[PDB]
């Protein structure tokens, strides 16, 4: 019951079991995020 | 012109002449005038939007549309006072070539 991801063949990917038991082995995502650094050219409106 | 002031505008076109050249008294008509066919006026910022891997960077014309550099342009004098570092880096090589 703790390990339906490892043992059970009818396990759906992403299905937890949170209210009753802490399923001990799940299918997580791992995000390789990239954080951009903003550095641009600043202009100014001309005269007239 | 007696007091070293001059009327009119200024043209920056590549002219590889070998014979006579007279910059103050130009013979025939000027190449284009603001509002002519396929002549665009630069916007008041003089900004340039840089396009990515393999395209060409474009000026932002009168309005908000980005128009490409190689063609004709009407640079008002005020925009050139706040975009000379963007003039001399981008459009001025397309004047020389």
Overall description:
The structure is cut from a larger assembly and holds 2 copies of chain A. With 48 residues, chain A is low in regular secondary structure. Chain A is 0% helix and 0% strand. Chain A has no helix or strand. At the A-B interface, loops of A face loops of B.
Largest interface: A-B, 7 and 11 residues
Intertermini distance of chain A: 76 Å
Number of helices of chain A: 0
Q: Which radius of gyration of chain A do the C-alpha atoms yield?
A: 24 Å
Helix and strand layout, with pairings?
This is part of a larger assembly, with 2 copies of chain A.
Chain A: no helix or strand
Features:
part of a larger assembly, 2 chains, 48 residues, little secondary structure, rod-shaped, viral protein
What's a quick, concise take on this entry?
Chain A is largely without helices or strands and about 50 residues long.
